[PDB]
Design a protein around this ligand. Sequence first.
Ligand SMILES: [Ca+2]
Ligand SMILES: [Ca+2]
Ligand SMILES: [Ca+2]
Ligand SMILES: [Ca+2]
Ligand SMILES: [Fe+3]
Length: 316
Amino acid sequence: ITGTSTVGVGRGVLGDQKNINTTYSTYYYLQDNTRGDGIFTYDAKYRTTLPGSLWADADNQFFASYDAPAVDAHYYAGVTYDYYKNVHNRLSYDGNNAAIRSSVHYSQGYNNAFWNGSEMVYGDGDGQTFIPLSGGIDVVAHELTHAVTDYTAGLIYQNESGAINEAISDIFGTLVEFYANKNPDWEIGEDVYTPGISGDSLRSMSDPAKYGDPDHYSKRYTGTQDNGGVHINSGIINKAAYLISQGGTHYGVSVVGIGRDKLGKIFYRALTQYLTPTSNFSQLRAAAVQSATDLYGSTSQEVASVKQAFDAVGVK
Ligand SMILES: [Ca+2]
Ligand SMILES: [Ca+2]
Ligand SMILES: [Ca+2]
Ligand SMILES: [Ca+2]
Ligand SMILES: [Fe+3]
């Protein structure tokens, strides 16, 4: 669309008010011209054909409940873009300011969200297991990070490489949650998961075992479900990442925490410089150690903490 940049206001899934970047051209559209080649949000109108219609509104106010998920998807994508740019100096997911597109109201009662190789897609949930998934900034950032991985390391979506791909999305989705300071935690999807149950989440990075995911290499899943457990075995890497950041003693191995910022710097470098499509956990460890070495010196505490953390989860 060609028009005038402007700012509208609406309410998100959780009921919070926010301003969003819109474009005016007869209608007000969910098209943000202020970030790279634009952020565009579309209405999939409960169908599965994609992307749907670019979101159009008559008055630049988005307070209808049908609007909620579009508001959050649109807003959270901007935040995520900002994170990458500000923090890592990366322009959009491709590093070249590619347009970011998302569709909401995908299908009916769809309890998931995903990156389809071209854009993001969000379900509204069934209202019981989930509410519209774009209401969780960690979910939005998790999805956009899959784009980042596709353009960089290109980790194949299965077995260990796939678990790495998933851990990357949880790690950066969490870093983005802290970046925006939106009630941050080391949990995944807490804000849109089981509206009825307080205190739970989809996955835990601090204690993956809480939900039955492995927190040690010896406990990895070796079967075929879930593409070889990409969503399960990511727990081992997630735990490692939590330890690197926060520190702790796990299975008797003590790790000194070095903080979130450094965690992000080290993982981003590994991702972008050292990982390949078929990298396995053991290769990830080598990569993370090399990155930290690059950044902080081989005799650094940083390097030391990365080593301990992997030893702690049993990754050699
Ligand atoms: Ca309106
Ligand atoms: Ca949170
Ligand atoms: Ca979270
Ligand atoms: Ca819940
Ligand atoms: Fe994922």
